């Protein structure tokens, strides 16, 4: 009944949360842009983060982050 999907991000979030708290912000969001280092940096981070923190609270936790990779499909 169960499937391999949560375990994937479960390990990603742990490594993604360099701040060590449980949520991701503009600071950590850079972790994805750092791989490209394109112009999107210092700009796209503020617009991209909007995807993760789609709760209107001011931070993204282990949940909405799963929607990120979801786009990969």
């Amino acid at each position: 009944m169960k499937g391999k999907s949560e375990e994937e991000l479960s390990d990603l979030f742990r490594m993604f949360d360099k701040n060590a708290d449980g949520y991701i912000d503009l600071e950590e969001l850079k972790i994805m842009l750092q791989a490209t280092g394109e112009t999107i940096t210092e700009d796209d981070i503020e617009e991209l983060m909007k995807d993760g923190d789609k709760n209107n609270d001011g931070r993204i936790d282990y949940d909405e982050f799963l929607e990120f990779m979801k786009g990969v499909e």
């Binding site: 994937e8 990603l12 394109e38 990120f68 990779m69 990969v72």
Partner: peptide, 20 residues
């Protein structure tokens, strides 16, 4: 308009091929 860049790739499944 793109949004996709690396973030998408290498995010399907963890594969490890041993030298064997």
């Amino acid at each position: 308009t793109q949004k996709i860049f690396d973030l998408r790739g290498k995010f399907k499944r963890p594969t490890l091929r041993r030298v064997r």
